[PDB]
Amino acid sequence: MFINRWLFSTNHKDIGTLYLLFGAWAGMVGTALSLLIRAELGQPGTLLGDDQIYNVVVTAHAFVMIFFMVMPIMIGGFGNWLVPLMIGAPDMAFPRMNNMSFWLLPPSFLLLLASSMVEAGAGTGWTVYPPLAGNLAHAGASVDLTIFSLHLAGVSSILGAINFITTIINMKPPAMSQYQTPLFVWSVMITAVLLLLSLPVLAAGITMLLTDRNLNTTFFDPAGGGDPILYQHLFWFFGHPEVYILILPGFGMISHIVTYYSGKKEPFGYMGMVWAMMSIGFLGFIVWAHHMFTVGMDVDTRAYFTSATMIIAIPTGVKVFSWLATLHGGNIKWSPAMMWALGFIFLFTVGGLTGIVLANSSLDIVLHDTYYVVAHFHYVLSMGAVFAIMGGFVHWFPLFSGYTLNDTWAKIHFAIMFVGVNMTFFPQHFLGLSGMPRRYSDYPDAYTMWNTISSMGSFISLTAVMLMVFIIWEAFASKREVLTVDLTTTNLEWLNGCPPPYHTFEEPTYVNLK
Amino acid sequence: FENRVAEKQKLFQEDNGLPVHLKGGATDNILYRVTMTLCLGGTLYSLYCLGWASFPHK
Amino acid sequence: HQTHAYHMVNPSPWPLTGALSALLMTSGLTMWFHFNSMTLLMIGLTTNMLTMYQWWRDVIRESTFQGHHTPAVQKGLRYGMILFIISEVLFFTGFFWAFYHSSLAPTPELGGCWPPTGIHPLNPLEVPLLNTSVLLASGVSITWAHHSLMEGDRKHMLQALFITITLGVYFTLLQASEYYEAPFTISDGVYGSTFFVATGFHGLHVIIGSTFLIVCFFRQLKFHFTSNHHFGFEAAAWYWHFVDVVWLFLYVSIYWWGS
Amino acid sequence: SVVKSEDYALPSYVDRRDYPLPDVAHVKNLSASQKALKEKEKASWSSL
Amino acid sequence: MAYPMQLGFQDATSPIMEELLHFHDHTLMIVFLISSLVLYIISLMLTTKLTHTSTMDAQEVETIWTILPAIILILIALPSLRILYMMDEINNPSLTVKTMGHQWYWSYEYTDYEDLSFDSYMIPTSELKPGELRLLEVDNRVVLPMEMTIRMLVSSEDVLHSWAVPSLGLKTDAIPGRLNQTTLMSSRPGLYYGQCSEICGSNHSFMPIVLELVPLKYFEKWSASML
Amino acid sequence: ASGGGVPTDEEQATGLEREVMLAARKGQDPYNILAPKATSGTKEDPNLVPSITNKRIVGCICEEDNSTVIWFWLHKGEAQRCPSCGTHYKLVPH
Amino acid sequence: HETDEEFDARWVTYFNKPDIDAWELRKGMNTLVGYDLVPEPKIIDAALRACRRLNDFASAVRILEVVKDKAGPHKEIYPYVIQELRPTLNELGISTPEELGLDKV
Amino acid sequence: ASAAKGDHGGTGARTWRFLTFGLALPSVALCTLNSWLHSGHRERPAFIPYHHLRIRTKPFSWGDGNHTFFHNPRVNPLPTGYEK
Ligand code: HEA
Ligand code: HEA
Ligand SMILES: CCCCC/C=C\C/C=C\C/C=C\C/C=C\CCCC(=O)O[C@H](COC(=O)CCCCCCCCCCCCCCCCC)COP(=O)(O)OCCN
Ligand SMILES: CCCCCC/C=C\CCCCCCCCCC(=O)O[C@H](COC(=O)CCCCCCCCCCCCCCC)COP(=O)(O)OC[C@@H](O)CO
Ligand SMILES: C[C@H](CCC(=O)O)[C@H]1CC[C@H]2[C@@H]3[C@H](O)C[C@@H]4C[C@H](O)CC[C@]4(C)[C@H]3C[C@H](O)[C@]12C
Ligand SMILES: C[C@H](CCC(=O)O)[C@H]1CC[C@H]2[C@@H]3[C@H](O)C[C@@H]4C[C@H](O)CC[C@]4(C)[C@H]3C[C@H](O)[C@]12C
Ligand code: CUA
Ligand SMILES: [O-][O-]
Ligand SMILES: [Cu+2]
Ligand SMILES: [Mg+2]
Ligand code: NA
Ligand SMILES: [Zn+2]
Fold it and tell me: What's the CA gap between A332 and A341, in Å, rounded?
C-alpha cells in the first residue's frame, strides 16, 4: 500500500505533497549553497578556493533554487493541490503522466549533484555560456551532466504544462467559463503556456551545446562558422519567460492571500488581473535580449529591447495597485500569511523598479554583470517568489495537513527572514553601482563593508530557515486539528474539509447557467 | 481476422480488483518484474558509476 | 462511485519506470561520451521501450477494453496532443533559428559566404525533391485512411494506412542513403551541424510517427477503432502532418534556400 | 458548545465583526431553564 | 576606482559617464517616489478600522494607474534613448587600440603605425608596492592619450571575457571570432580601473584593467619605447 | 470501393463511455456533462439539484458575468438560499 | 447609485417587511455592514423591530454592537445613534451592549 | 489558389483515394524516375584541409575516434585527407 500510494500515485493531492517535500529538501540544498557563497565573500581574501569551486557553488545555487525549489513548490506543489480543488475537478486530466513529471525530478537533481562531484564541477554560471562551458574550457562530464539535468527538468515541466493547460481548459464545471475561474488557476494556466513554448527552445540550445561538446558540431564555435552569441539568444529566449514563470503563480497566490485576509469575497479588478497576467506573459517573450546589452548589438535593437522591456511595468503596476485596492476597506486579519503577502507587494515593487533601471540599455552598460543585477533579481526572487511561497505555505498548510501552525512562531519567522533578506541584498545595490562584478570569489578592498554586511544578512536568513523546520515540526508534533475556516463561499478548495478526502468531487459541483 | 474485442472487454472488466497493468494475466506480472528489476538494478548501477567517476583515476 | 465523466486512473508503476529510464539514458549517454561504455545506455533504452509499451498498452486497455474514454476524456486527449505538437514545433524552431543565424551572417572562417567554402550541397531536385513528394503523398494517403475509417470501410482503411507507412519507411530509407552518400558530415562546420542535427531530429520524428502509424495499423487489424471513436488514429495523423510540415520547412530552408 | 471535525459541511458559527449575525446560534441545545428563557423572550423584553 | 563605503557610481571620467549619472539621478528619483508611494499606500490601507467589503467598481481607477505609469515610462525612455544614440554617434577617433581577453589576463595591440603589443597581468598581492591596490594593479598599464577620441576594439582568444572601465562608462564583451567596438574619451589624466566582467574560469576575479591617461606627447614616447 | 467491417460505437462502446452514450440518447445526463438551466429560484420554484448522496456543493453565479462564484453545501431537506443573492436550491437525492 | 434617501428608504422597507424571516434579517444586516457607511438610525430602528417580530433579543443587541464597529475611530457616531434610538430601545425593552456589560473586553 | 483540379461535392474516402492514386503516387513515381536517373557518382573534389571542416575538438565515441558516424570512404575525407 505504501508503494502503491506514494510511488505509483495517480492522485493530484499526494503528488502535490511529493512536490512540496521535494522542493523543501531542495530549498535546504539551495540555502546551504547560498551560505557558502556568502561565507566566501564575508571577508576579503580567499576562503574555499579560486573561482572554479566558487562558481560551481554559484551555478548550483541558482539551478537548485530555480528548478528544484521554486518551480516544484509553486507549480508541482500548490498547482497540483489547489487547481483541481479550485475548479471542482476530480483530479488532473492526465493523472498518471502527472506522476512522471514528479518522478523525473529526483533523477534531474541526482544528475546535478553528479555534475558537482565529478571532475571539477560545472563552474559556468546557470546560463552555461560557451565557450567556457565547451569541451576545451570545461572538459569532462560535469557540463554534460548539467545539460542532462536540465533536459529531465525540462521534460518534467513540459509534460506538467500540458497537464495543467488541459485540466484548466477541459475540466471546469460546464457552466463555469474561463472568466469564473480563480486568479491562482489563471496564473498556473499562463505559467504553463510559457513553459510549453520556452522550454523546447532551451532544450534545442542545450542540445546544440551537447553536440558541440561531444559530436564535433560547431553551432557556437567560430572555428566552424558558429557563434557564442547564438547560444545566448536561444538561452535567453527561454530565460526571460522563465523569470515570469517563477513569479506568475506567486502573483496568483498573492491575489488569493490578500483577498482572504482582507475579508473580501473577491480581488479588486478581476478582469484587469487576468489581462495583466496575460499581458505580462506575452511581453515576456519579446524582451530577451535585455540580457545581452553588452554583447555588441546594433543601437536600434538596443532601443527596441529597452522600450519593450519597460512596457511590462504597466500591466505589473495594475496588479500592484489592484492588490492595494483589495486591502482597501478590508477587515484586515494580521495573519502570518498576510505579512508575507504585504512584504511581497512592497519588496517585489522595489525589485521590479530596479529591473526598470536595468532595462535602460545605456545605463545597463555600467550595471550589467555587476551586483546591481544580483540585487534586482534577489528582490524579486528572495523577497518575491519566496515570500509568495511562504505566504501560500502558511495559509494552506492547514488545508493540506489538517493541522494548524503556531501563528506566533510563524510571525517570529517572518520577522527574522524579513530582516535577513533585506540586510543581505539591499547593500548589493551599492556594490553594483560602484562596480563590483558578478561571479567573483574575492573583491577589491573598497567593497569590504557592504560584502561583510551582506554576508551577515545571509546568516540571519539561515536562522529563519532553521526556525521554519522547527515550526513545521511543532505543528505536526502538537496536532491541533482544524475546525472551522471562514470565507469558504469564495475559497472552494477549503470546502471539503482539512485535509480533504483522497477523492474529492466524485460528485461534481452543481452550477447552473441561468 | 475476426473481431474479438468483446472478449477482451470481458477480461479487462472482470471484477477481480487487479490494476489495469496486471489485469491481462501472469504475463503482465512477468513483464512488470522485468521492467522494474532493470530500472532499479540499472539505477543502482548508475550510482556505482557515479561513485567511480567522482574520483580521479590515474 | 462517480457521477462525473472523467477517468480516475489505477495506480501505475510506469511513471516511475519512465523517469528511471530517463536517468539511465542520460547517465548512459554520459558514460558513452566520457567513459567509453554503452552499458547504462542500453539498459535505459530497453527500460524506456518497455515503459512506453506497457503504458500505452494500458491506455488501450482503459479505452477500447474498459470504456473509460467518454467524450470529455477524449476532448482532454485532443488538447494534450495539440499541446504536445506545439512544444515539438518550438523545439524545431530553435534549430531553424540556429540555421538562419549562421547562414544569413556567414563568418570569415566559412569564407564569409553561404554555403561555406568547401561545402558541396546536395542537389535539392534529386533525392530531397523525391522525399518531399513521398511525405506529401503520405499526407494524402493518411487522409484517405481517415475518411475510410469514418465511412466504416475496414479494407480501404488498412490499404491506405499501409501505403502511408510504406511511404514513411521509403523516406527513412532514402534519408539513410542520402546520409551515407553525403560528402559533408556533421563535423563539417556549422553547415554540417545544422544540416544533420535538424534533419536528424526530423528523421527521428519520422521514425516515431511511422511507429505510431504501425501501432494504429495493428490496432485496426484487431478491430479496436470504431467509425466514430479512434483518437489514437487521429493523433497519429496529426503527428504525421506535423512531420510533413517540418520537412517542407527543412526542404525550403536548408536544402533549397541554403544551397 | 463542541465543534466536531465531521461537521465541516454544515453551517458553522463565526465571530467576525463584518459578519455580525452568523449562520447558526452559538448554543443549539437548551436546558429546561434555557427553554423557559426562550419562551419568556416571546413576551416584552422589558420584563427580562 | 571605487572607494570604501561607496553608495553610488564612480565619479565620471568621460562626458558619456556624466550623462549617465544625471540620467540615473532622474530615474532613481522616480524609483524612490514610486517605492515610497507604494509603501505609504500599504500603510494607509492597513491603519483604519473603517471597512467597505462589498464589490468595488474598477473601470475608472484602472485608467489612472495605466496612463500614469505609461507617462512615467515615457519620461524615462526619452532621456534613456537620447543617451543611447549619443553613445552611438559617429565621432572620428584619432587612435585605434585592440584588447584581447585571455585566461586570465588582457593583451593590448596598438597597430595603427608600428606593431606594438603586450600582455597585462594582475599584480599578485604578495608583490604589491606600498599603497598599491589589491586585485586592481597590473604590471603593464594601458597607456592612452587624454582628451582624445579613442576607438577600442575588443575580442578574446579563448572564452568570453568582458572589458570594463566603470568610470568611463565602458563595458564591451570580449567574444572569440568577433571584433566589438566602443569609443573612449577621458576628460582627465590619471589612472582608471576596471575588472573582467564575464565569468571566464578559475581567475575571472583576477584579470583587471588599468588605463593610464597622459598627454599625447608622453603617450607617443611611451609607445615608441614599448616597441 | 466501399465495404464495411469497422465496428460502430453502438456495437462496441463499453463501460462508462457506453453509459454516457445510452443516457444521451434518452436525453439524460447522469454524468453531469451539461450545465443545468436555472429555474426562477423562488421558494416556490427552487433550483432542483440532483445528488446520489444527501449533500452536494452548489456554485452560484449570482448574476450573469459575475466572475466570483459563491460555493456552499446543499443538504437534503428544506430548500437553502445562496448566501449572496438568496436564490433558492433544493436537493433531490436519488 | 441612488440618492442617500432612496438607499435608506429601500433598507427601511426591507427590514419593515412584517413577515421578514430570520434568514432575511441576517442577510440584511450582514450585507448592510459591507457598505462604506454607518446605517442611519431609521434603518437600525426597522432592523430592531424586525428582531422583535422574530423574538430575537440577542440579535438586537448585536446590531447595536455593529453600529459602533462600523464607525471605527469616529467615537461620536455610536452615542448619537443610541440617542436617536432611545425611544425605540425603551419601547421594546432593548438594553444596549454597555448596559449589559458586553463592551468589556 | 484552387490548384487546377476540381471535385468536392463531398470530400470523402473515394475522393481521397482518387487523389492518392491519381496525383500523389504518380508524382512520387515521376520523382523516383527523375532521381534514379541523376544518380551516378559525382567526382569527389580535390582534398583541401580547410580548418572550418573536418572539425575534431573531441574524439567521437565510436570507432577510432576519427570517423564520423556514417563515414563514406569514397566521399568523406579524414582531417588528413581521403583514406586508403
Ligand atoms: C521573479 C524573477 C524576475 C522578475 C519577475 C523579473 C522582472 C523584471 N526584470 Fe529581471 N531578472 C531576473 C529575475 C526577474 N526579473 C533574473 C534572475 C535576472 C538575471 C539573469 C542572470 O543574468 O542570471 C534578471 C535580469 C534582468 C535584466 C538584465 C540585466 C543585466 O544582466 O544587465 C533586466 C534588464 O532589463 C531585467 C529587467 C526586469 C524588468 C523590467 C522586470 C519587470 O517585470 C518588473 C516590472 C515591475 C515593476 C516596474 C514594479 C511594479 C510596478 C508599479 C508599482 C507600476 C509603476 C512603475 C513604473 C512606472 C516603472 N531583469
Ligand atoms: C529562486 C532563486 C533564488 C533564491 C531564492 C536565492 C536566494 C539567495 N541567494 Fe541567490 N542566486 C540566484 C537565485 C536565487 N538566489 C541566481 C539565479 C543567481 C545567479 C547565478 C549565476 O550567477 O549563474 C544567484 C546568485 C547569487 C549570488 C551572486 C553570486 C555571484 O555573482 O558571485 C549571491 C551572493 O550573495 C546570492 C545569495 C543568495 C542568498 C544569500 C540567498 C538567500 O536569500 C536564501 C535564503 C533561504 C531561502 C530563501 C529559503 C529557500 C527555501 C524554501 C523557500 C523552502 C521552504 C520550505 C517549505 C515551503 C516547506 N545569490
Ligand atoms: C532518416 C535517417 C536518419 C534518421 C535519424 C538517425 C539518427 C537520429 C538520432 C537522433 C537524432 C538526434 C540528434 C542527434 C544528433 C546528431 C544525429 C544527427 C543525425 C545523424 O545521423 O547525423 C549523422 C552523424 O551522427 C552522429 O554524429 C551520432 C549519432 C548518434 C549519437 C546521438 C547522441 C544523443 C543525442 C542527444 C539527444 C538529446 C535529446 C534531448 C531532447 C529533449 C527534448 C525536451 C551524420 O553522419 P556523418 O557521418 O556525420 O555524415 C554523413 C557523411 N556521409
Ligand atoms: C537526453 C535524453 C533525454 C531523455 C528524456 C526522456 C524522458 C522521459 C522518458 C519518457 C518515458 C515515456 C513513457 C510514455 C509516456 C506516455 C504519456 C501519455 O501518453 O500521457 C497521456 C497524456 O499525454 C498526452 O496525451 C499528450 C502528451 C504525450 C507525451 C508523450 C511522452 C513525451 C516524452 C518526451 C517529451 C519530450 C518533449 C520534447 C519537445 C521539447 C495519457 O495520460 P495518462 O495520465 O497516462 O492517462 C490518462 C488516461 O485517461 C488514459 O487512458
Ligand atoms: C535579436 C534577433 C536576432 C537573433 C540572432 O542574431 O540570431 C533579431 C532578429 C530580428 C530583429 C528585429 C527585426 O529586425 C525588426 C526590428 C528592427 C529594429 O531596427 C530593431 C527592433 C527589431 C524588432 C529587431 C530586434 C532584433 O534585432 C531582432 C529580433
Ligand atoms: C475588455 C476587457 C474585459 C472586460 C470584461 O469583459 O469584463 C477589459 C479587462 C481589463 C481591461 C484593460 C485594463 O483595465 C487595463 C487598461 C485600462 C485602461 O483604462 C483602458 C485600456 C486597458 C488596457 C483596459 C481595456 C479593457 O477594458 C480591458 C482589456
Ligand atoms: Cu576574464 Cu572574467
Ligand atoms: O529576466 O528579468
Ligand atoms: Cu529578462
Ligand atoms: Mg555579461
Ligand atoms: Na573571498
Ligand atoms: Zn447567488
Answer: 12
**Measured distance CA(A66)–CA(A70) in Å, rounded:** 5
Residues 6+ apart with CB under 8 A from G55: D41, D42
- Chain H, 33 to 62: residues with Cβ < 8 Å from chain A are 51-52, 55-58, 60-61
- Dist CA A499 CA A404 (whole Å): 11
Chain E adjacent subunits, 3+ CB pairs under 8 A: A, C, G
What 8-state DSSP symbol labels residue A45? S
Phi-psi region of E74 (alpha: psi -120 to 50; beta: other; left: phi over 0): alpha
Confirm or deny that A378 is annotated as ligand binding: yes
Residue A272 Cα to ligand 6 midpoint, Å, equals 6
Interface contact G31, partner D, CB < 8 A: no
Would the CB of E63 count as within 6 Å of ligand 6?
Answer: yes
Subunits adjacent to chain F (3 or more Cβ pairs under 8 Å) = A, B, C, D, G
Fold topology of A2-514: Cytochrome C Oxidase; Chain A (1.20.210)
How many contacts, defined by CB atoms under 8 Å, are there between E and G? 21
CATH architecture of E92-227: Sandwich (2.60)
From A274, A273, A247, A267, select the one nearest A387 (Cα to Cα). A247
Q: What is the dihedral of CA C38, C40, C41, C43, to 10 degrees?
A: 120
Spell A170-190 as b/e; 16+ CB within 10 A means b.
bbbbbbbeeebbbbbbbbbbb
- Name, in order, each residue with C-beta under 8 angstroms of A260's C-beta and a sequence gap of 6 or more: A337, A395, A487, A491
Pick from H37, H38, H72, H68: nearest CA to H54: H68
Locate the domains of chain E by residue range: 2-91, 92-227
Beta bridge partners of E116: E110
Boundaries of domain holding B18: 1-58
Which helix H or strand E contains C236, and what residues bound it? Answer: helix C231-250
Domain count, chain H: 1
- CA gap G62, G60 in Å, rounded: 5
* A290 noted as active-site residue: yes
Q: Out of A12, A138, A290, A413, which one is annotated catalytic?
A: A290
* A270 Cβ below 6 A of ligand 6: no
State how far the Cα of E35 lies from the Cα of E30, in Å rounded to an integer.
Answer: 8
Q: Is F85 annotated as a binding residue?
A: yes
Rounded Cα–Cα distance for residues G67 and E159 (Å): 73
| CATH number for the domain formed by residue range(s) E2-91 | 1.10.287.90
SS in 3 state form for A210-270?
A: HHHHHCCCCCCCHHHCCCHHHHHHHHHHHHHHHHHHHHHHHHHHHHHHHHHHCCCCCCCCH
Nearest CA in chain G to E50: G72
Resolution (A): 1.8
Solving technique: X-ray
Q: Which H/E stretch holds residue C249? A: helix C231-250
Dist. CA C167–CA C163, nearest whole Å: 6
**Cα E119 from Cα E124, distance rounded (Å):** 15
- Tell me the residue type at H75: V
What nine digits make up the cell of A70?
A: 521554486
Domain boundaries along the sequence of chain C = 1-68, 69-259
Element (H, E) at C43: helix C39-60
Give dist(CA A14, CA A6) in Å, integer: 7
A59, A142, A191, A255: which is the annotated catalytic residue? A255
List CB contacts of A303: < 8 A, sequence separation 6 or more: A361, E81, E84, E85
A225: nearest CB among H52, H58, H60: H52
Give dist(CA C201, CA A83) in Å, integer: 35
Output the CA torsion sign for A279, A284, A285, A288: positive
CA distance A277 to A191: 9
Q: In a mutational test of the pocket of ligand 5, which residue from A237, A238, A302, A304 has the highest number of ligand atoms less than 8 Å from its CB? A: A304
